[PDB]
């Protein structure tokens, strides 16, 4: 399943 | 026979036009298996492979989940990116992310990635270690010094290594009706007369999986090194692909002409002539 | 503030045999930025189909299919009108049988 991504730019 | 997980991810900033939409989409090797769009009626997770229905409700939860979280992340993304460039807040921008995972044919990891583009262009990559970054430029390298100190690197690797590959799995034996086959092509050589003395002879090949494949014409036997004419592969609109390869050959010596078809479903290489 | 022009390829799913129900595909690739108008058109006339999901390949570029169901044949005029920013007027590309 999916990827969570919690940093961002 | 190398099996692969990939997540698409697209984020569009339309200022004035409303919120950014955000389409993610799920793919084991060439089959496209899950399906998310902000746009959409339903605003969850959807299914695309009748292997990939067959998992249960907090599957879904998740996923949506996962995806609906994403979505805040490249939102403020784009709205961190518009300082950095110092771009003007009127005009639409474009981030994209493609992660996943690859299995060796023993059925161990082989590869994965994690890889980011702002319009268009490279913006930072996950090295072949899963554990180094690589930026394209200064506005990427702060990007990636946030990223090392928030231990993303080593988030990733941890999923990549755990549960990417045990999904993977999952999704090849639970699909092996689909995905474990491969569709082997349908080829046919037709014969259209431009005029008297030349004639078109085209290779269709159709019908088949993966979308990997090598169109080779050869002449008495004896191969054509410069380009041909020929299509970019397309998809049948099913599962299954189409490509298809041209030369032109003087009328009544279509014998001294042979198509050579390179597919992971032909065990020995096929070759056609027009029948 | 990167531009890739589309490239369209429009076909059907099986050989075209006149009057026999068919899927009409019009395959857009290569194309950046990611908003693009694609409509597939009968006699002109906007025909409702379905868009897949949008996806992109190594360089960045993203590819669509859009397709519907036809009935192949030589009187009716079948085409993809694609609508973009690279594009100076919305192209417009008929449909072939022996592709």
């Not at chain 2, 991810?9 to 004035?16: D, E, F, K, N």
């Not at chain 2, 639970?174 to 003395?197: C, F, M, W, Y």
């Not at chain 3, 390829?9 to 009057?19: D, F």
Request: net charge negative; charged share 25%.
């Amino acid at each position: 399943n999916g990827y969570n991504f919690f940093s961002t730019f | 026979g190398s099996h692969s997980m990939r997540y698409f991810y697209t984020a569009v900033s339309r200022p004035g036009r409303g919120e950014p939409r955000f389409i993610a989409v799920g793919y084991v090797d060439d089959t496209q298996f899950v399906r998310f769009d902000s746009d959409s009626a339903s605003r969850r997770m959807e299914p695309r492979a009748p292997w990939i229905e067959q998992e249960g409700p907090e599957y879904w939860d998740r996923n949506t989940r996962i995806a609906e979280d994403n979505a805040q992340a490249f939102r403020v993304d784009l709205q961190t990116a518009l300082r950095y460039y110092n771009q003007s807040e009127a005009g639409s921008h474009t981030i994209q992310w493609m992660h996943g995972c690859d299995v060796g044919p023993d059925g161990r990891l082989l590869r994965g990635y994690s890889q980011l583009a702002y319009d268009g262009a490279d913006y930072i990559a996950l090295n072949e270690d899963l554990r180094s970054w690589t930026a394209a430029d200064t506005a990427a390298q702060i990007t990636r010094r946030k990223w090392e100190a928030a231990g993303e690197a080593e988030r990733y690797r941890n999923y990549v290594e755990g549960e990417c590959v045990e999904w993977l799995r999952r999704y090849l034996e639970n699909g092996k009706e689909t995905l474990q086959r491969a569709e082997t092509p349908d080829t046919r050589v037709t014969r259209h007369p431009i005029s008297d003395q030349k004639v078109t002879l085209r290779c269709w090949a159709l019908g088949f999986y993966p979308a990997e494949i090598t169109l080779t014409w050869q002449q008495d036997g004896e191969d054509l090194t410069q380009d041909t004419e020929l299509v970019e592969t397309r998809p049948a609109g099913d599962g299954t692909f189409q490509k298809w390869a041209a030369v032109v050959v003087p009328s009544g010596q279509e014998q001294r002409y042979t198509c050579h078809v390179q597919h992971e479903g032909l065990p020995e290489p096929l070759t056609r002539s027009w029948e | 503030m990167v531009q890739h022009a589309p490239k369209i390829q429009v076909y059907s799913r099986h050989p075209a045999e006149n009057g026999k129900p068919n899927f009409l595909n019009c395959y857009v690739s290569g194309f950046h930025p990611p908003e693009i108008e694609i409509d597939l058109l009968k006699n002109g006339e906007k025909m409702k189909a379905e868009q897949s999901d949008l996806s992109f390949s190594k360089d960045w570029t993203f590819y669509l299919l859009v397709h519907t169901e036809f009935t192949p044949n030589g009187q009716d005029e079948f085409s993809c009108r694609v609508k973009h920013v690279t594009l100076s007027e919305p192209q417009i590309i008929k449909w072939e049988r022996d592709n």
